[PDB]
Structure 1
């Protein structure tokens, strides 16, 4: 209900401020009248002319109906109490209407008509009215098919400079202001505002406020991506407009009655200050916080200091002093808010103040400590927040005293029902008691019993932030007082009813035993541990890692102290390994996966028999989400017990795996391909070649995967089996693909050609490929070009020979059939050029550079960036001198194009190797006013 005041915001300097004064004065008039004694307040004809847009008439009908409208009020009571009714007669019976009148015109929601009504009328073809009329391409962006949204979006991007910001925003801001607005539609209009604001710069100046009013509500939002977007577009707006534009714009919102606009406005100043930098905007602020008019302003400006602290964060560091010098005067102010928010802003500062600038906070302290005594309520807690973040920044001697003073109040204040309180004092306890200069026993006595008393309760854990922060603080207390204490007190709660609580203590134990190590733990408490962890693990309402990673970390930390507990574990593991069909199978499986090594090193072989054949049996499970976890478990078991010792000998296993690859879904596909990879890489002899080549012809279509890691493991496996067999057959099976499917992974086969060419010497393979460029089918031609590219990228030095072989073919390819040839071939020239460096082959690379050189000119992004990479690699390989000898004449050529490009190149050549260029600048004669000959080089002994 707090945010919906957005709906009350009408669309959009001395006049601007003059308006706020009148606004507040009318507020005092009305408010005053009631003491003297909303949207329904009667209106005036100028106010009436204010709302409706252009082109409407208020002409009435006769002089006997307006008096009916005046008696209507009296007759709303009177004639409603009178005779009336309606009826219908049976009689036999034109029907006009309008949807969107256009070629297609994707559909209009019943409300959006109000906005898009002008498009409905079909009157056409007779100035500005036609620009608003054609601007309905918005409608195509809002609703329609995704392609319509794309093409529309571009079309309106390139028309920015044409239409101007005025008509656009005039036709947009109502939509982005719409009460019925979607999520997506919002986000899309945000996109169009960005893309048009990458172009328009000086133009937006009148509309800046008129923008921010809608945009500032994006900064305060439940969605995160909405927030990062909002900060981005306000960054683009402020940087886009001028500083003075922003400043002079946004003043009147500081004293605005509603605090909402003040707040979101503060975050606005935070964003713009990130844009244009702190020092530029300082005098504005420093002027604001000293404003003597009213407090609300200073409250705002201080909040601005804060949000600057959060946003800029670590980068505040240089101006920290000046900022402090601003804020300090509010701590002593008579108003309360200003004090509270002030000290809070100090907190945010210090928290972004990484272990330094302590003396900059210096003058701030002595009041704060004093205040620590006398305060009741929220302000107190706020001070505790500030001081809390401060203490890590002090000296362990001064902070000794000061800390020991804070500990008292810290103790006393555990018990307040305020959750803000508990957050603050919590994080405080972290920083104060996580100090190296604090003594264990003092904490053990004074703190821990009240800490676990008041803080560990079922109010906390259900909340999110309190959950996390609690976890952290407890973790650190463990970091000091030791392990067995904390854990020993919280173990008994593993068996507590609720989940979220169990989850909490479980992850706590996890992190604790992660850091300190399990060595400190005694015996009995360890029994309660393992039993606790099993018990909690046996009841899982949701699927999550916390319990699992928890268990794994506990066991791997215990080491072989866990050995007596195995049979109970794995008994539970099998029985659970049935029980829950889709729920728990995957989970018990993963439990095995993470417990593998522990079930290995202790040398329980029967257990490996168990897991081996038992898990072997589930490979016929039809549920994928289970089967995946099963294969994962098998994987982990392979990494502990070796090839020849597998209780399910690979002869059994692998062909039993082979048919599963039709599973498609990554869940089974991921782990499966992984395991086929481990076995195919490691042993690889156990299986006959026929099985392997079948595996190949099955692997071929795994490249339709929508996931990148699937293709990853796939290609690497394909290399492994390429080693298991040898090149020619399998690279031929790769060349069987004509790259007809451009979706999923196509070039991936190309990568397989590369890695295959590595696994056994390409010194064998190349002639087959180079022959296969002959084929008239073009896309596979550019395919084998890519194969050369990745090929040289992987081979590196070994290309000192094959350069020659590839050289004439690159000649044929680089000579252009179609752009992709020039591009890909150019990439080949690049990776070749980095690879061969320094070995003395430069000549042929120069020859190829000839044919490279004409391609310099084009607007296609991929070919121009390709050519850039090309000429960069050629720069390092050939040496700059030859490059520059191609780049000289282009610098000063009359045309703009040639200069743009040759200067881009010459820059690329210039940044690197700027040291070595000296010799190669030619002799340039000296003119009248200037001496252009460097005579130093002509000094002769």
Structure 2
């Protein structure tokens, strides 16, 4: 009927149309859902999710509106909990991070809003379902719902399910639930570890292969969730696991090995060492297994065993390194992804534990292999080892072999990846002074890679130069660095944008490593060459050139004429519409250095004229620029211009200058106590009931000044400012409420809680309700912070004939 006839229109409005229309439609959906109900609304919403042709955007919007309407409704979704659950199950079973996060949030909201009894009633029957996908999604649902509202409320229920005898399916489901709780909760199951261990023990004893495998997985999950402590609660599981290790084979063997490897770090050093010695024979017997999953499992087990302190370097080297290294270095197993990452992690952990010497000395030869994946793997291991351990263990032979290997690897640059550059940079940084003889070779190779076939490999060459400039400068080869700089200077005419950005980054690095006065290119000609680069449109070149000219202004401002200073300021104003925030921050920094170098008159006049762009993106940037100019220059030479610009009746100009005053007061801090008197008439004018934005800006200025001048005795003007700020509490807009609350908090921390208590005591018991509510919230805000002074600031209340309200202990006289 009419209730349903108003549903599809809103659905088509929110699914089709401009964003304003769908936002408004969502607004009256949220507003009118109190009278709409839940029954027909869900009866119409759910078939939309049941549509096979559902899209990502439609599903996301519908789940969001369902989440909001369910948050609004406390206990009005009880009859449809089962439907919501069974329709969210496909949403959460998906392999999308955002989708599964939204699904788990939905189920948590279901658990919080709805009672446990109805959930149990609609929840029990599907535990013993024959289909496996529904069992998996129901296991995820149990995990999230037990995460909500706490696990102990349903822990005995889980024990009862796991103690089932009718079929092994119920025990499998219960062990899956325990594993899911272990994998999701993390550290929230530590107090309840013993009961879960006892529950999983008898399932482990069970003869069913699936049941014992899932029990081993649950034990491993519990161990990894209780990694720091919990061996005392796990010492009763070791014997069946050892029996399975010594008897079972196949997938069960893999699960038991994973469980024991997870449990090994839990115990002490001696027990872990003995168990690693026991399992090393089986590990060696299993290394050459064709299965990739088992190889990954044994790699993880080996890494965990090696991470423990029970083993020793000599023993591990003489037992496990030769066979593992012989059977775990092949291209066929290197072609994988999970095997790739697991092998990298295992090798780097082993190198950290036992040492890097041999583990790099007998892989530098393999670095020469023509395979690109093998080269990438060995270089990743090398760079991880260099970053983690260090490089103070290399002799001449190993270091020259490593240099030859890295040079050969970089020479055969076939794939497109930055890992090449990262590895080379880490290697050269780790080597330090010991690589100084070889620098001409790298210089020649990088030059040869630079000058060929029209700027394609020049990107990585310039990135490499920028990365290695530090060691290049510390190698005392100043003439070579100057030669590279000047050559790259005439190589500035490249049309390619990414190549130009790499060139700009390399120029930044070379001018940063060495002093600017020693740079061979002409700066007086460099700036006119960089100005067209400033007029470029690509983001990378724009940010690089803006930071470069910021460095120019910071250091090399003496050799730059004021005419081109003003011009590049003009294109800085023009460029302020950049999308990236880093570009805008660098731009306002450039204004700061320029105004520090030259008198803040022309730049200030140009900045003050950019407050009429009809877009707040440029206005805030100009505000920050004006604030930084006033901070880096004399404040008393900027304020009169700010007031003169305020004199115009332009609302945008007034808002900009007020924000500039707020930012300046925030930046200067305690030094600005002398300028408090100069801005009092402006604050009084802004605090007048004319514009909400004016009141917000005035409150922000008051709060910033109060925080800045706190502790220096400036209460005379602060009290007068509060006298006008206070009548702004009665507002409805959230932004002005937040600004007023911040201003009053600053005035409280500056003046003291006594005056705030005096003001808030006027209407704490007012006959009306809204004034009482706002006074109570203000009083709570005051009472939360600096409570120890209100006791002295409390007033005196006369006691009644039935209760005592007078503290007689304070009336004692000595």
For the pair 1:838 / 2:711, whether they are aligned, the reply is yes
Residue 589 to residue 874, structure 1, CA distance change in 2 (3 Å): same
SS at match of 1:169: helix
Alpha-carbon separation, structure 1, partners of 2:231 and 2:534? 62
* CA deviations over 1:367-387 (Å, ceiling 9, x no partner): 222321111011111111111
CA positional deviation for 1:832: 0.7
Does the CA-based 8 Å contact 2:516-2:556 persist in structure 1? yes
CA positional deviation for 1:237: 1.9
Residue 462 to residue 850, structure 1, CA distance change in 2 (3 Å): farther
SS at match of 1:135: helix
Residue 288 to residue 891, structure 1, CA distance change in 2 (3 Å): farther
Alpha-carbon separation, structure 2, partners of 1:732 and 1:423? 67
CA positional deviation for 1:893: 1.8
Does the CA-based 8 Å contact 1:385-1:428 persist in structure 2? yes
* CA deviations over 1:183-235 (Å, ceiling 9, x no partner): 22222222112221221120111111211212122222222221222222222
CA positional deviation for 1:580: 5.8
Alpha-carbon separation, structure 1, partners of 2:268 and 2:183? 25
For the pair 1:275 / 2:118, whether they are aligned, the reply is no
CA positional deviation for 1:497: 3.9
- Between 801-810 and 459-468, report the one with greater CA deviation: 459-468
Does the CA-based 8 Å contact 2:4-2:41 persist in structure 1? no
Once the two structures are superposed, the pairs formed by residues 905-920 of structure 1 within 5 Å of their partners are 905-920=778-793
1:588 aligned residue: 461
Residue 743 to residue 852, structure 1, CA distance change in 2 (3 Å): closer
Residue 583 to residue 152, structure 1, CA distance change in 2 (3 Å): farther
Residue 673 to residue 395, structure 1, CA distance change in 2 (3 Å): same
Does the CA-based 8 Å contact 2:3-2:36 persist in structure 1? no
Residue 876 to residue 385, structure 1, CA distance change in 2 (3 Å): same
* CA deviations over 1:590-640 (Å, ceiling 9, x no partner): 010001011111122332123201211232222111111111111111221
Does the CA-based 8 Å contact 1:705-1:744 persist in structure 2? no
Aligned-residue Cα RMSD (Å) equals: 1.8
Work out which of the residue numbers 565, 583, 603 in structure 1 matches 2:438: 565
Does the CA-based 8 Å contact 1:618-1:627 persist in structure 2? no
Does the CA-based 8 Å contact 2:289-2:295 persist in structure 1? yes
Alpha-carbon separation, structure 1, partners of 2:430 and 2:721? 60
Residue 811 to residue 636, structure 1, CA distance change in 2 (3 Å): same
Alpha-carbon separation, structure 2, partners of 1:907 and 1:328? 52
CA positional deviation for 1:451: 1.8
Does the CA-based 8 Å contact 2:504-2:544 persist in structure 1? yes
Q: Which runs of 5+ in 2 are unaligned?
A: none
Residue 490 to residue 220, structure 1, CA distance change in 2 (3 Å): farther
SS at match of 2:666: helix
1:351 aligned residue: 224
Does the CA-based 8 Å contact 1:880-1:917 persist in structure 2? yes
Residue 277 to residue 582, structure 1, CA distance change in 2 (3 Å): farther
CA positional deviation for 1:459: 3.6
CA positional deviation for 1:130: 4.4
For the pair 1:224 / 2:100, whether they are aligned, the reply is no
2:20 aligned residue: 147
1:753 aligned residue: 626
Does the CA-based 8 Å contact 1:924-1:933 persist in structure 2? yes
CA positional deviation for 1:173: 1.5
CA positional deviation for 1:541: 4.2
Does the CA-based 8 Å contact 2:265-2:304 persist in structure 1? yes
CA positional deviation for 1:711: 0.9
Does the CA-based 8 Å contact 1:135-1:168 persist in structure 2? no
Residue 165 to residue 331, structure 1, CA distance change in 2 (3 Å): same
CA positional deviation for 1:463: 2.8
* CA deviations over 1:547-569 (Å, ceiling 9, x no partner): 11111001111112222322221
Does the CA-based 8 Å contact 1:664-1:702 persist in structure 2? no
2:326 aligned residue: 453
Residue 752 to residue 565, structure 1, CA distance change in 2 (3 Å): same
Once the two structures are superposed, the pairs formed by residues 478-517 of structure 1 within 5 Å of their partners are 478-517=351-390
Once the two structures are superposed, the pairs formed by residues 218-257 of structure 1 within 5 Å of their partners are 218-257=91-130
Does the CA-based 8 Å contact 1:331-1:338 persist in structure 2? yes
CA positional deviation for 1:583: 4.0
CA positional deviation for 1:719: 0.5
CA positional deviation for 1:582: 5.7
Work out which of the residue numbers 718, 721, 729 in structure 1 matches 2:594: 721
CA positional deviation for 1:261: 1.3
* CA deviations over 1:662-720 (Å, ceiling 9, x no partner): 22332111111111112211231111222211111111122211111111111112101
Number of residues paired by the alignment? 814
CA positional deviation for 1:480: 2.6
CA positional deviation for 1:164: 1.8
Residue 336 to residue 921, structure 1, CA distance change in 2 (3 Å): same
SS at match of 1:159: helix
* CA deviations over 1:109-134 (Å, ceiling 9, x no partner): xxxxxxxxxxxxxxxxxxx3343344
CA positional deviation for 1:584: 2.0
Residue 391 to residue 908, structure 1, CA distance change in 2 (3 Å): same
* TM-score (normalised: structure 1): 0.84
Does the CA-based 8 Å contact 1:739-1:783 persist in structure 2? no
For the pair 1:526 / 2:403, whether they are aligned, the reply is no
Does the CA-based 8 Å contact 1:389-1:431 persist in structure 2? yes
Residue 818 to residue 503, structure 1, CA distance change in 2 (3 Å): same
Residue 679 to residue 444, structure 1, CA distance change in 2 (3 Å): same
CA positional deviation for 1:890: 2.7
SS at match of 1:768: helix
Does the CA-based 8 Å contact 2:611-2:622 persist in structure 1? no
SS at match of 2:130: coil
SS at match of 1:543: coil
CA positional deviation for 1:849: 0.8
Does the CA-based 8 Å contact 2:611-2:619 persist in structure 1? no
Residue 766 to residue 556, structure 1, CA distance change in 2 (3 Å): same
- Between 534-543 and 253-262, report the one with greater CA deviation: 534-543
Residue 223 to residue 540, structure 1, CA distance change in 2 (3 Å): farther
CA positional deviation for 1:728: 2.4
Residue 241 to residue 841, structure 1, CA distance change in 2 (3 Å): same
CA positional deviation for 1:529: 1.6
SS at match of 1:797: helix
Alpha-carbon separation, structure 2, partners of 1:635 and 1:551? 20
Alpha-carbon separation, structure 1, partners of 2:731 and 2:415? 56
Does the CA-based 8 Å contact 2:699-2:739 persist in structure 1? yes
* CA deviations over 1:301-356 (Å, ceiling 9, x no partner): 22122222222213332222332232222110122222211221121122121321
Alpha-carbon separation, structure 1, partners of 2:456 and 2:226? 47
Residue 301 to residue 895, structure 1, CA distance change in 2 (3 Å): farther
Residue 131 to residue 935, structure 1, CA distance change in 2 (3 Å): farther
CA positional deviation for 1:899: 2.3
Q: Which runs of 5+ in 1 are unaligned?
A: 1-127
* CA deviations over 1:804-829 (Å, ceiling 9, x no partner): 11112111001132110001110111
* CA deviations over 1:231-282 (Å, ceiling 9, x no partner): 2222222212223333333222211121211111111122122221222232
Alpha-carbon separation, structure 1, partners of 2:667 and 2:678? 17
1:306 aligned residue: 179
- Between 816-825 and 559-568, report the one with greater CA deviation: 559-568
CA positional deviation for 1:492: 3.2
Residue 192 to residue 940, structure 1, CA distance change in 2 (3 Å): same
* CA deviations over 1:701-755 (Å, ceiling 9, x no partner): 2221111111111111210111111222222211011242425442111111111
Alpha-carbon separation, structure 2, partners of 1:152 and 1:528? 69
Does the CA-based 8 Å contact 2:227-2:265 persist in structure 1? no
Residue 143 to residue 486, structure 1, CA distance change in 2 (3 Å): farther
CA positional deviation for 1:787: 0.6
- Between 775-784 and 280-289, report the one with greater CA deviation: 280-289
Residue 461 to residue 241, structure 1, CA distance change in 2 (3 Å): farther
Alpha-carbon separation, structure 1, partners of 2:484 and 2:125? 72
